[PDB]
A paper describes a structure:
DnrK is a canonical S-adenosyl-L-methionine (SAM)-dependent methyltransferase that catalyzes 4-O-methylation in daunorubicin biosynthesis. Recent studies have uncovered that DnrK is bifunctional and catalyzes additional 10-decarboxylation as a moonlighting activity. Here we have taken advantage of the natural diversity of anthracycline methyltransferases and employed extensive chimeragenesis to probe factors that govern catalysis and substrate recognition.
Region R1 in CalMB is extended by an insertion of three residues and has a Phe to His substitution at the critical site in comparison to RdmB. Despite these differences, DnrK CDDD behaved similar to its R1 provider with the highest yield of hydroxylation product (46%) shown with 5. The structure demonstrates that two aromatic residues, H300 and Y346, are positioned adjacent to the channel. The analysis is complicated by the fact that DnrK CDDD crystallized in an open conformation where R2 hosting Y346 has moved away from R1 and, as a consequence, H300 does not fully close the solvent channel. However, it seems likely that movement of R2 to close the active site will lead to rearrangement of the H300:Y346 interaction. Despite the different evolutionary paths of CalMB and RdmB, the chemistry appears to be mechanistically similar with exclusion of bulk solvent being a critical feature.
Numbering used by the authors:
A (entry chain A), B (entry chain A): 13 to 287, 296 to 339, 343 to 356
The structure:
Amino acid sequence: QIDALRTLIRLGSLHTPMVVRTAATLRLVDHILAGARTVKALAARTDTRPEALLRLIRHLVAIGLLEEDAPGEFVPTEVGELLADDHPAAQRAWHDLTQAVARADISFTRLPDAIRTGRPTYESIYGKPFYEDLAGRPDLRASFDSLLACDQDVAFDAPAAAYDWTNVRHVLDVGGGKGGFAAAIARRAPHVSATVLEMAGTVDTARSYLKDEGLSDRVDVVEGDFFEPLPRKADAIILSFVLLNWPDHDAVRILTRCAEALEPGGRILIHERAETADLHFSLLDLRMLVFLGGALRTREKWDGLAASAGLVVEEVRQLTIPYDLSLLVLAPA
Amino acid sequence: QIDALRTLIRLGSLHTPMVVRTAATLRLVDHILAGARTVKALAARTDTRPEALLRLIRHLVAIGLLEEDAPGEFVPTEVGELLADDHPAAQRAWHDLTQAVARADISFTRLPDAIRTGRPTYESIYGKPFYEDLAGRPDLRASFDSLLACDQDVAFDAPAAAYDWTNVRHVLDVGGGKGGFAAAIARRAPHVSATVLEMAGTVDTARSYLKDEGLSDRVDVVEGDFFEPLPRKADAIILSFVLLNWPDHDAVRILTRCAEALEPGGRILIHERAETADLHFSLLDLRMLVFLGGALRTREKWDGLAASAGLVVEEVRQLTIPYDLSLLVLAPA
Ligand SMILES: CC[C@@]1(O)C[C@H](O[C@H]2C[C@H](N(C)C)[C@H](O)[C@H](C)O2)c2c(cc3c(c2O)C(=O)c2c(O)cccc2C3=O)[C@H]1C(=O)OC
Ligand SMILES: CC[C@@]1(O)C[C@H](O[C@H]2C[C@H](N(C)C)[C@H](O)[C@H](C)O2)c2c(cc3c(c2O)C(=O)c2c(O)cccc2C3=O)[C@H]1C(=O)OC
Ligand SMILES: Nc1ncnc2c1ncn2[C@@H]1O[C@H](CSCC[C@H](N)C(=O)O)[C@@H](O)[C@H]1O
Ligand SMILES: Nc1ncnc2c1ncn2[C@@H]1O[C@H](CSCC[C@H](N)C(=O)O)[C@@H](O)[C@H]1O
């Protein structure tokens, strides 16, 4: 009743996440951590009005991201210190309006259009569809790859383990980001070679990362388009968090091109999510609707797509954050 | 540590308030309350895709606004029933993107600009400054007046009581919305007459409301502009939640025009807020920054403005939601 009003007001509140986002984009906590105690030093480091920044700090204190320690000095709280840039969970970057994802969340402001039409709303705001906007803006293209690659060192270890590489000769990582998954498979299967197929811009950072990993001998990088014939056959084609970017009819074209590049005996491996993990799942799934018109799919939806592409789901293996991921294995129907 | 990640993600989350806002704008709960049990009936009442609306409902269930009662039937929770349209707290309308305020919260998406410049960001989005956009869009103009007038029946009773009307002949309600405050003063002081000075559009709804109140005999309505000479003198000039819409230099011009329309012995009465009331206060104050470039002011800020307009603060009286309001009394310096 009395709390029913307060819970709705807090859940319906738009200023609160933009205050956090401004704080991240201003790099407020790093500037506090670099020794800006007063509001005056802090406005001067961030190029902001002193009195407008106090009003933001005041809200930041009241949502728990900041404390007034000495009168006028402001310290990050324990929640607030997750906004430091070197912090392992990368949450400052994921809330930076200057970067690709927190920029893309602005599409949620036209959420009604996406519910009415089913189509993404990103284009209405920024001019081109998600990945064309990145193709034209190298800062956003780069920002996107490092945001998604923020756990490349550990996030592919468990999926790579989950699979038997003994009879695999080559591996095709289709849209494999910076190559972290090809890298994990290389450091577990010492006899396997790999190719990463990615877009312009990303090919150069994946190559640079695989070089500095010591793996340019074993993992190549081909620039290309996975809607066209893949540049070589393989015994394993990896799609890690790719098909969720796409509506069903495009997802099928991707899976068909892979089925064609599949060698005799081959398997297609899909790495994606399953079903506060409901709030984690609901955020990613509403993000795919409003950015790209993709979706997270259930098991019965996968057999649909798979059947439509000439494939069958062999098995589903179940694998750092509170969330279980899946590894779908697909062979010719 | 583990909760530090979850608290930041929830506080930085932009989809969650837009999901609530979409639900309000779609009038989802009223349609459920009018007996749409299934998602199919519900998509057809709201003109939405069935599968996109299930994804929104799914997030609405997980933030507590909805429950799955029978498989596929969805009921509002106790929080969620605050989104019913006839509910006294009017929270459906305050979250409706079609209405003036939830439409204006979109300015919070450019929050960094307001911190850097101190200037409102509403104009950058919608073409004209806040009140010019309303002057051109009668639906928004009307929406704004009824949103602010949602407690006209009770919200002015305590301020009206707090003041002695015995020697007051006339009262000028400067920017008095739909006239609810002139109305409260009339129903307590039976010998006082009043004028409401308001903008185009609002004058007609205030007149209609004061008519249906039985008070068109005692309370007049003049259309006008409070930056120009007021249309008549008075012994009491009321500014209820007006000066917070304005930067200091404009606030002074408003107070100067009032000082001039003040009769011998007169008093200027300012009705505004004071200092989870910190979250209530911080929302209204960041709203005034991003919509109009106004601000909530402390006591020492009031003496500033007051001194600048030729006035002095006589006293401050302290007065339904968890929040204390103030009534400042101002006389010639
Ligand atoms: C924070 C959890 C997760 O990292 C899960 C998930 O990230 C997982 C797997 C991810 N992996 C695919 C490399 C990596 O290990 C990361 C640290 O954890 C995830 C996330 C976000 C995105 C995506 C995510 O996959 C996207 O794929 C994505 C995309 O393909 C295109 C545009 C945007 C995105 C994403 O924003 C994250 C998420 O669910 O946030 C709610
Ligand atoms: C919900 C609390 C309150 O009603 C207080 C406050 O509302 C109070 C006083 C208000 N009164 C001035 C008539 C009325 O009784 C209402 C029910 O409660 C308030 C509110 C909102 C606004 C405003 C508010 O004054 C505005 O004045 C305002 C404006 O002048 C111009 C544009 C927008 C607004 C507002 O959005 C509300 C608020 O603080 O929300 C956070
Ligand atoms: N038509 C296309 N051809 C090839 N790659 C594409 C593509 N459209 C999108 N992509 C790539 O698909 C990737 C999916 S998002 C990154 C996911 C990555 N596998 C990871 O798990 O970290 C993006 O990096 C994008 O550059
Ligand atoms: N230049 C101007 N002249 C007169 N009224 C104005 C004005 N600029 C804004 N206003 C009015 O000032 C009001 C302030 S908001 C409504 C507050 C009202 N007193 C209440 O307490 O309910 C608005 O209704 C708006 O129409």
